[PDB]
């Protein structure tokens, strides 16, 4: 039972999901910064 438990533990994995969310928020922040700087320097 405990070996099967650690088997499902090794199955999950979670690292792809956390990398997905990390790269998503990174791209969002980067796009926000790009738009902000572009608008600011266009106005200036």
Q: Measuring CA to CA, how many Å separate 7 from each of 2, 15, 18, 28, 43?
A: 8, 16, 20, 35, 58
Which pair of structure tokens corresponds to residue 4? 């099967």
- Separation CA 4–CA 10 (nearest Å): 10
The DSSP symbol for 28 reads H
- Separation CA 7–CA 27 (nearest Å): 34
Resolution (A): 6.9
Place of tokens 């199955």: 11
Length of the chain: 44
- Separation CA 16–CA 39 (nearest Å): 34
Helix locations, the chain, DSSP H: 2-11, 14-43
Place of tokens 């997905």: 20
- Separation CA 16–CA 22 (nearest Å): 10
Place of tokens 């039972």: 1
Task: Give, for 1, the enclosing helix (H) or strand (E).
Answer: none
């Amino acid at each position: 039972v405990e070996s099967l438990r650690d088997f499902q533990n090794k199955k999950g994995q979670l690292l792809p999901y956390v990398k997905v969310k990390d790269h998503k928020e990174k791209l969002n922040i980067y796009k926000e910064e790009y738009e902000r700087a572009k608008a600011n320097l266009r106005a200036i």
